[PDB]
């Protein structure tokens, strides 16, 4: 049972038959030439080694034919003519076979290998050049706040040319595997236990979204069943399909699993834009990486706009200097003293509150939500001291041992 | 027979480091300052550091320089071990300098090795075990075995990545091509050195008395004459080792090539038959056509627009459409080819509007399917 699949069987059959033909034919020619032949009363022999005859049949079977070891018995010559034809005939019958058993190989087989401290996240579902691009252009954006993780796709069937071009264009970061998250063996090839999350993607233009959402749910069931505590993020098409995720035993959004719903957000942005014109873009930029790269030939309005597109959301724990302030005071200090815009806070029992009323106090070690240039720019809110640093003018030194 | 002194140095280098790695692992099985250098070496090898990238480019260029020293040595003629005293001699010690540079680089990787086992049984580690140790034997013994020094040529396999770093090649087709062509010359150059060594040596069964004094250039030619299956029989081999290497070379070339026939067919087949741009011949005017371009829709227009008289005025007629014309339209196009041009493309793309010089065409005509199954969509 050393060989298993039909391809290896055939191969071994073909290769065995080939060496069997070659070894035997060499003995036959060796006999004739070392004998001479009866027409010349065995006087016309060539004293060839069997090794020369084995070599000579390779040199002729390959159609190279150096003409170093030519035959001279009439029986040798006539055997060589038959050998040429019967080899061409046998080989021509096997050309198709060879082409098939060569062609059956998967171009995207194998397993992912975990390079110790290098992290990665898995992607599966509706993987297509467009659906990949709009994700990948953010996930592999030219800055990420200086963090790198590998991105590993698995899908069944081939990527198609445009996606293969995109894959090759990023090949140090990205990997693709033939397979499906419906199979525990593929969840093992892709080391799901050692990936830190899995992202599941869907066809926004599916001709029946109930079926696409049913298919994407199935997966989350497969992934959660294989290893309970994995982080999962799933793209649903319709709103009401979210109900089914809450039924899965090891689904927990407080723990940190999540579902993004296309119909919920797509119309929700449009709706807020009816209440406040243009707001859709304020939102769409504030939650996606953009490159602030001002140049002198830009218009004045384009430069101010871009700097505005450079803004990002971050979150941080506030300094003890914020203890028992009211929210408007914390916001005034963040804006005026730190040059940070503070939107919202985590408050205990967990809940999120945006622009809280003056009736609240900011409690110790609450997490705040900031709009800023970079995560580094926000760290001042964690460090700032009402005794030690409130006197400081230039904010680029607020991190210190005094507290 | 001085040559055994050289190849022994390669063998003991490989075997002693192998045994040390085996001891390490089995001892740790049967029972931190490194970690900075580990990752720092990994960066320099990645070439995401500009230094690491530069040094990789230099490692590659210096590998090409090493082969020139080998071809000059092969240009010296005479037997496979032949020498004169090294004292201020010729140019020799430049490849000692290159060998220690490569051994230093080999230590870097050893540091970055991950699994020492698979690092020690690596193709380029074999290249290093063969070339590095005999270089010292040569200057020490005051003698020169030509040896396996041509193996360094496998570093030509760097070219696809170097041209990716410099971004000289872009599309997947050019990538592949360059990979295939590089692998082909790497195989050809190296195989020639291997055969050259055998035949100029003779072989042990005939106590090295049966040699052929082939140049490396003859061996490089001879492998082309056999790889092409032409086989003139002018430069036939005669060592048993040469003959048996030639038999293996024939089979392994046929096997490699047969695996790549499909690939070659695909990367050949992907070319657009109707690519390119229209070039404006100054005072010659033209008008653009696009939309439902089909043999019939073309014909009934074209038979008026290119009618045998027009009141004596001539302008070129330039179609663009996505996908191929089909045979009957291609026949009509060839039948008028001095007047008419066809381009793969669409007026939905500003780059195609530029290839077709829309700013310098004097009009554009847009054509539609009269028999569309839903005219609202066609309109």
Author numbering:
A (entry chain B): 214 to 561, 567 to 621
B (entry chain A): 14 to 44, 79 to 426
Sentences reproduced from the published study:
BK channels comprise four identical α subunits (Slo1)2,3 with seven transmembrane segments (TMD) and a large C-terminal cytosolic domain (CTD). Additionally, two homologous regulators of the conductance of K+ domains (RCK) in each subunit (RCK1 and RCK2) assemble as a tetrameric gating ring (4× CTD) and serve as the cytoplasmic Ca2+ sensor.
Neutralizing arginine at position R3 (R202Q) drives the VSD towards its resting state, as suggested by the rightward shift of Q-V in the homologous mutant in hBK36. This narrowing exposes a more hydrophobic profile due to the side-chain rotations of residues F304 and I308. In this structure, the side chain of I308 represents the narrowest point in the permeation pathway (radius ~4.2 Å, HOLE). However, the tight closure at I308 was sufficient to occlude entry of bbTBA in R3Q apo. In the R3Q-apo, the αB helix is partially unfolded at its ends (residues: L374-K381), unlike in the R3Q Ca2+-bound state where the αB helix (residues: L372-R382) is reminiscent of all our open structures.
